[PDB]
Amino acid sequence: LDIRGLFRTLWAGKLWIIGMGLAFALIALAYTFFAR
Amino acid sequence: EPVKRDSPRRAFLMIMWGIVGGLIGAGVALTRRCSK
Amino acid sequence: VMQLASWDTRREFWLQTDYYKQRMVGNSKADAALLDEMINNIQFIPGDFTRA
């Protein structure tokens, strides 16, 4: 398990992770406001 | 009258947060070995 | 047995002894901490008739 390389891999692609997490949070917000 | 507070038990918080910080710092240092 | 295991009994007993009085330092917090520490110094272990 090359965790040292894994750190660089996750550092390089952090923008996509943050954007998709924010999109998922927005979807959750919409579902919450669409519920009883 | 209680002699000691139940919260936030400063010593336990110090120990736990220091252990967590040391673990994550060791992980960061390990990940930096292959960065060179 | 109920008196033996009672926290209040241990508290009053320690309060009325010279062993605790000689160890008092005059500070209310320290005296209370010492009293609480010595209350726990008396431990009651209930028996079990099944194990005799």
Q: What is the SS3 assignment for C4-46? A: HHCHHHHHHHHHCCHHHHHCCCCCHHHHHHHHHHHHCCCCCCC
Question: How far apart (Å, rounded) are the C-alpha atoms in residues C32 and B2?
Answer: 9
Chain B: residue whose CA lies nearest to C29:
B3
Which is nearest to A8 in space by CA: B21, B26, B28, B23?
B28
Q: Which amino acid is at A36?
A: R
Q: Which amino acid is at C48?
A: D
Chain B: residue whose CA lies nearest to C34:
B3
Burial of C9 (0-12, 13-18, 19+ CB in 10 A): middle
- Put simply, whether B36 touches A (Cβ < 8 Å) is no
Which is nearest to C36 in space by CA: C16, C18, C20, C48?
C20
Helices C7-15 and C28-39 cross at an angle (nearest 10°) of 130
* Greatest C-alpha distance within chain A: 46
Determined by cryo-EM
Residue written as tokens 């390990």?
Answer: B30
- Put simply, whether B1 touches C (Cβ < 8 Å) is yes
